[PDB]
UniProtKB/Swiss-Prot annotation, chain A:
InterPro entries: NADH-Q_OxRdtase_suN/2, ND/Mrp_TM. It is found in: Cell inner membrane. This is NADH-quinone oxidoreductase subunit N. Its main location: membrane. GO terms for biological process: ATP synthesis coupled electron transport. It comes from Paracoccus denitrificans (strain Pd 1222). Keywords: Cell inner membrane, Cell membrane, Membrane, NAD, Quinone, Translocase, Transmembrane, Transmembrane helix, Ubiquinone. GO terms for molecular function: NADH dehydrogenase (ubiquinone) activity; NADH:ubiquinone reductase (non-electrogenic) activity; quinone binding. The chain crosses the membrane at residues 9-29, 37-57, 76-96, 104-124, 126-146, 161-181, 196-216, 235-255, 269-289, 301-321, 324-344, 369-389, 402-422, 446-466. NDH-1 shuttles electrons from NADH, via FMN and iron-sulfur (Fe-S) centers, to quinones in the respiratory chain. The immediate electron acceptor for the enzyme in this species is believed to be ubiquinone. Couples the redox reaction to proton translocation (for every two electrons transferred, four hydrogen ions are translocated across the cytoplasmic membrane), and thus conserves the redox energy in a proton gradient. Its EC number is 7.1.1.-. It holds the Pfam family Proton_antipo_M.
Curated annotation (Swiss-Prot), chain C:
It is a multi-pass membrane protein. The lineage of its organism: Bacteria, Pseudomonadati, Pseudomonadota, Alphaproteobacteria, Rhodobacterales. InterPro entries: NADH_UbQ_OxRdtase_chain4L/K (IPR001133), NUOK/Mnh_C1-like (IPR039428). One of its GO terms (molecular function) is quinone binding. It catalyses: a quinone + NADH + 5 H(+)(in) = a quinol + NAD(+) + 4 H(+)(out). The gene is nuoK. GO terms for cellular component: NADH dehydrogenase complex; plasma membrane. This is NADH-quinone oxidoreductase subunit K.
Length: 479, 50, 101, 121
């Protein structure tokens, strides 16, 4: 550690320092009487750290013998993760208090998970990748199971823990093979050794194990079956978190690994990523048709959308990475909007999650249904929504790389998936006899629905430089 | 008959298979992950070392 | 003569055994926690084997951190199992099945 | 390796020797003492009256949480042994890095204590 190393990781130290101080403040000055105050200070902390990461002048570099990489790619990913995490906490604050779920440790656990994500996207070494991933994963298991009186929370944590641990073991086994072949954990050393003429079955086995281990975290098929059960079982605020911030961090990590460690064997891993993307797009679309629980529908929506994002990465190009980044940004915005509405659903003062509760909602609350309509067409990828332009970008990358067969399959699965988004619109606007679901939203939760919904249309006019920012970020990674 | 047979006969039939495979049993989900790795390893082996 | 391949073979056997324990167990979630520990032990055998045969300490450093996460995983795994047992009265794998579809 | 042969082979040899001594002591009575088992003799002891049940029932462990924290604290102390052995050669970062590491440990320990996790359920 030099003073230059410490400066590079300063945003991470600031977040880590806050988490420790918040833990002591909550323990010694009121415990749950500070729970509401700690949640909102955490939201400010996430935004402050994002400002440190994203604002001012930045010069790309590395710290700690290359184990930590501070480049434009990692800065793009961190900002989206932190802002998405801040959004989920802010919009869920009222819901958790009403449901007697706001422990003063919940904001802190989320903060340490985000800290793990920040080390994931800036990994320049296999050990940094692992420690960042495991700090995030352990925090995610806890919040999945934090509704103690719910057998479904306990089962969600149990399934996530067991399958997450299995994927982590596979990731470690591949990481051990890669280290044995290359003689080092640093990616700059690894990339120089993994090249066309020297790929033994052993090192190719290592890549497969690492890829499969990571593809679990983005719910790629057939490493996806945890997602529907965990999404259903966990508290809806925790489900909203799983759907936005970890997926962005995990998707960026996969791009970091395949380009900074396996960037000279693109041909080998591009085919595997494409096969994952195909299976995820069709299963997510087909399985989503059979869902009656809205939370469980969003899991299959999540799986299908990660398949599309993987199409951009399967391209193996700077444009593919640029468009994968924009896709994840737009996907996170859409999920924040949708889960803001899902949190509000309730009948007789208790939360409700079944799709039939939406019948004729458009004639109960016109503005909220109109927002939900824009989000469903945005998730379906239909113009003029910003969700369409996300799909357009990854499809552009695929065709640009001579993978039109992947683009054709991608758009076909989109048609199947469009059915269950259309069905939600059908229920709200011309559905069957209504059972009195009401949407309870405070000011913050209300803006968590409207602003993402407005962004789906305003973004169609101007992306406000985000598309250009993603291109610069992709260049620093791919080179 | 063809259009409805595909849109309303086939795709729902594939939906029911997908729902069935999501059995809810933890050991089945782990089996799927192991089948995925084993299948991918078979794919890598056929391409060979190179 | 014992070379690297000997240790990798032992690692592979323990690794497959630990993976096998997860997706064949039905009656006890604690035995799954034991299988996860077998799987991570197999990983450390690889890291130590590669480390000593290369003459490098990184693999041994990696092993120390795998133990750290293994300890944290066991603590959280048992804590999650405790809350399930309280809510269900059982820890059989076949009983972690309410959510499906 | 010489270090293995000179220092660790004796451990393996003595492990067998100590095992042989313990086994011979058990077999001494097994071969010499009179064996005369009957159903009352081999039944379970509960102070003269028959046991209500055997000892294969669930039992609440009121120190379960402390035992989970025992696992965590075990790994924390493990990082100190290489540090203590290397103490003479430590750099300034290596020294104060441990102090930061131990400070994070103490925050966790203060959280357990204040929460009440060290009191039995
Ligand atoms: C900016 C700091 C947060 C101030 C928030 C003001 C809200 C007022 C409030 O009620 O909560 C403040 C709270 C202390 O709670 P207080 O209400 O004073 O307790 C009463 C005693 N029972 O204060 C808190 O909740 C403090 C939370 C900890 C903030 C950590 C600050 C350090 C940041 C990390 C830097 C790391 C650098 C290395
Ligand atoms: C106080 C300030 C709050 C935090 C704001 C951080 C600002 C970060 C930022 O602008 O980063 C810039 C970065 C690109 O940087 P660069 O390419 O260098 O730009 C050229 C500069 N010369 O740009 C990026 O990295 C792009 C980041 C885009 C973020 C998109 C949003 C992510 C998902 C969250 C949606 C939130 C929904 C709203 C919720 C409502 C309430 C619940
Ligand atoms: C994506 C976008 C996401 C952003 C959306 C933002 C929406 C606007 C938020 C509105 C203002 C905050 C919410 C106000 C509120 O409800 O107050 C929370 C809390 C009240 O406390 P109390 O009433 O005691 O609650 C317990 C009993 N119910 O008291 C508070 O208000 C808590 C203190 C306010 C928050 C902190 C402000 C100070 C800045 C702290 C910076 C972080 C410090 C760490 C970083 C250090 C940097 C070096
Ligand atoms: C009613 C009749 C409907 C029949 C289907 C309609 C045809 C759909 C074809 C879509 C267009 C694909 C295309 O033009 O090919 C993509 C690509 C050409 O691009 P390329 O030369 O790689 O340029 C790289 C840029 N640097 O690659 C090629 O050169 C051709 C790749 C073809 C990909 C498969 C096309 C199958 C057609 C669809 C079958 C039905 C579904
Ligand atoms: C643990 C997580 C919580 C972290 C919160 C506390 C951060 C560290 C303590 C605060 C002061 C550190 C200032 C560093 C000074 C410097 O750069 O010069 C070194 C300085 C010499 O550098 P020079 O000035 O370049 O010669 O060395 C020293 O004398 C001090 C060494 C301290 C080592 C502490 C290591 C821990 C910090 C890394 C945290 C990990 C990320 C967490 C996520
Ligand atoms: C996409 C559309 C296609 C969706 C269907 C995919 C499944 C194809 C069949 C493979 C599994 C065969 C065994 C189970 C058959 C179900 C049945 O009737 O038994 C009930 C039965 C439940 O019985 P119970 O659990 O004993 O009550 O199902 C099972 O036993 C589940 C089998 C688990 C092990 C195999 C897991 C395979 C994972 C598949 C993930 C998706 C990959 C392929 C799709 C990619 C997209 C193109
Ligand atoms: Ca690169």
């Amino acid at each position: 550690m030099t003073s230059l190393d410490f400066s590079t990781i300063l945003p991470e130290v600031v977040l880590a320092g806050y988490a420790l101080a918040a833990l002591m403040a909550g323990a010694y000055l009121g415990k749950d009487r500070l729970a509401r105050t700690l949640l909102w200070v955490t939201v400010a902390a996430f935004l402050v750290v994002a400002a440190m990461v994203g604002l001012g002048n930045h010069v790309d570099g590395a710290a700690f013998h290359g184990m930590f990489i501070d480049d434009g790619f990692s800065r793009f990913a961190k900002v989206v993760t932190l802002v998405a995490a801040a959004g989920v906490l802010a919009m869920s604050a009222d819901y958790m208090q009403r449901r007697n779920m706001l422990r003063f440790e919940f904001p802190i656990i989320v903060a340490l998970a985000v800290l793990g994500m920040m080390f994931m996207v800036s990994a320049g070494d296999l050990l940094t990748l692992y420690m960042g991933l495991e700090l995030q994963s352990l925090a995610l298991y806890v919040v999945a199971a934090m509704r103690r009186d719910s057998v479904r929370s306990s089962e969600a944590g149990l399934k996530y823990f067991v399958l997450g641990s299995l994927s982590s073991g596979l990731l470690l086994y591949g990481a051990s093979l890669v280290y044995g072949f290359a003689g080092t954990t640093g990616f700059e050393g690894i990339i120089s050794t993994i090249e066309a003429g020297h790929l033994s079955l052993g090192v190719l086995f290592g890549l497969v194990f690492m890829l499969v281990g990571l593809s679990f975290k983005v719910s790629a098929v057939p490493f996806h079956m945890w997602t529907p059960d965990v999404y259903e079982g966990s508290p809806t605020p925790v489900t909203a978190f799983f759907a936005t911030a970890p997926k962005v961090a995990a998707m960026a990590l996969i791009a970091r690994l395949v380009f900074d460690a396996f960037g000279h064997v693109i041909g080998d891993w591009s085919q595997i990523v494409a096969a994952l993307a195909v299976m995820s797009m069709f299963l997510g679309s087909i399985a989503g048709i059979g869902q009656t629980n809205i939370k469980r529908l969003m899991a299959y929506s999540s799986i299908a959308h990660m398949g599309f994002a993987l199409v951009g990465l399967a391209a193996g190009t700077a444009i593919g990475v640029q468009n994968m980044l924009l896709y994840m940004t737009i996907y996170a915005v859409m999920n924040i909007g949708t889960f803001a509405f899902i949190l509000s659903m309730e009948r007789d003062g208790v939360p409700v999650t079944d799709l039939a509760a939406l019948n004729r909602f458009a004639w109960t609350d016109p503005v909220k249904a109109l927002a939900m309509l824009v989000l469903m067409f945005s998730l379906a990828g239909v113009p003029p929504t910003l969700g369409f332009f996300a799909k357009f970008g990854v499809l552009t990358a695929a065709v640009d790389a001579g993978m039109g067969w992947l683009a054709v399959l991608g758009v076909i699965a989109s048609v199947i998936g469009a059915f269950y988004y259309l069905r939600i619109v059908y229920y709200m606007y011309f559905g069957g006899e209504s059972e009195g679901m009401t949407s309870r939203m405070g000011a913050v939760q209300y803006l968590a629905l409207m602003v993402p919904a407005l962004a789906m249309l305003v973004g169609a006019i101007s992306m406000f430089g985000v598309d250009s920012a993603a291109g610069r970020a992709a260049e620093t990674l791919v080179g | 008959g063809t259009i409805n047979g595909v849109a309303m006969g086939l795709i729902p039939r594939l939906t029911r298979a997908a729902v069935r495979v999501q059995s809810g049993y933890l050991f089945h989900y782990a089996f799927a992950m192991v089948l995925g790795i084993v299948g991918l390893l078979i794919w890598v082996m056929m391409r060979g070392a190179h | 003569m014992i070379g690297l391949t000997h240790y990798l073979v032992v690692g592979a056997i323990l690794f497959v055994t630990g993976i096998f324990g997860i997706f064949v167990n039905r009656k006890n979630v604690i035995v799954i926690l034991m299988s996860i520990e077998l799987m991570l032990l197999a990983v450390n055998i690889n890291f130590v084997a590669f480390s000593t045969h290369l003459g490098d300490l990184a693999g041994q450093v990696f092993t120390m951190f795998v133990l750290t996460v293994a300890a944290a995983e066991a603590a959280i795994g048992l804590a999650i199992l405790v809350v399930f047992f309280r809510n269900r009265g059982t820890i059989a794998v076949e009983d972690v099945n309410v959510m499906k579809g | 390796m010489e270090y293995l042969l000179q220092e660790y082979l004796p451990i393996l040899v003595f492990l067998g020797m100590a095992s042989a001594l313990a086994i011979v002591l058990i077999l001494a009575a097994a071969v010499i003492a009179v064996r005369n088992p009957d159903p009352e003799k081999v039944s379970a002891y509960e102070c003269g009256f028959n046991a209500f049940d055997d000892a294969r029932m669930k039992f609440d462990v009121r120190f379960y949480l402390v035992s989970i924290l025992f696992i965590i604290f075990d790994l924390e102390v493990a990082f100190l042994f290489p540090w203590a052995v290397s103490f003479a050669s430590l750099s300034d970062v290596a020294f104060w890095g441990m102090m930061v590491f131990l400070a994070v440990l103490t925050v966790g320990f203060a959280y357990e204590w204040k929460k009440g996790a060290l009191e039995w359920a």
